[PDB]
């Protein structure tokens, strides 16, 4: 599944960013996607937290083209 794609809709966009923020705030208890750590830990430090949220921000601002963690 797609890294950063926390609602499992195939793409990484603002909805994933808003969901990540709400998830870290515990405004939601969990992501719609299955494997939280696979989709949400985008830098691959085996933690989901504001660092991941910031990577999503960087991605959406086109500061980076992909996340540090990869499928390969």
């Amino acid at each position: 599944a797609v890294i950063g794609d926390v609602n499992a809709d195939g793409v990484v966009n603002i909805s994933d960013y808003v969901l990540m923020k709400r998830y870290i705030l515990r405004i939601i208890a969990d992501f719609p996607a299955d494997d939280d750590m696979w989709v949400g830990d985008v830098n691959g430090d085996n933690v989901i937290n504001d660092i991941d949220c910031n990577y999503l921000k960087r991605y959406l601002l086109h500061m980076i083209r992909e996340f540090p963690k990869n499928s390969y």
Binding site: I14, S15, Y17, K21, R22, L60, L61, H62
Partner: protein
């Protein structure tokens, strides 16, 4: 590509035209009109400019942006001559949604003084175009954005 989509809500995004002279530094306002009153939670929007004619020196949030220090970011992708905006009501409690029409950002740009080099015209136009555009409400429902491109009309100096 701005994807053709269908949704329950819509707004208009406009580049407000400016008339300037080669060499000027000017502000280009970017506006939202017909903002849904129930509010925008987040948006991500790209613009492109022609780096042969325009240099972007600053990007600032507009008056309709709530808590911009926390809610508003931009990035200029210099290699692509692209300006990317990201807005999100960061605290996620529905209290900083954008519900009002007006200026969402202002670009400060310099019009290159040498744009008429090797040209016999006294008037040129430079287009400001859009890329991807994504908006949603508090419930993550999409809000469509009708994008209207803009132009800088540029007069030769002297």
């Amino acid at each position: 590509i701005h994807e053709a989509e269908t949704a329950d809500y819509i707004l208009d995004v406009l580049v407000e035209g400016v008339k300037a002279k080669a060499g000027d530094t000017v502000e280009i306002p970017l506006k939202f009109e017909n903002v849904p009153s129930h509010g925008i939670q987040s948006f991500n929007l790209s613009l492109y400019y022609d780096s042969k004619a325009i240099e972007v020196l600053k990007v600032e949030p507009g008056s309709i942006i709530t808590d911009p220090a926390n809610n508003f970011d931009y990035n200029i992708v210099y290699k692509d001559s692209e300006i990317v905006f990201l807005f999100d009501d960061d605290k996620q409690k529905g209290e900083g949604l954008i519900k009002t029409d007006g200026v969402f950002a202002k670009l400060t740009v310099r019009i290159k003084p040498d744009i008429f080099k090797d040209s016999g015209s006294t008037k040129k136009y430079s287009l400001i175009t859009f890329g991807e555009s994504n908006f949603c409400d508090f419930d993550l429902k999409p809000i469509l954005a009708v994008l209207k491109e803009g132009k800088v009309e540029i007069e030769k100096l002297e």
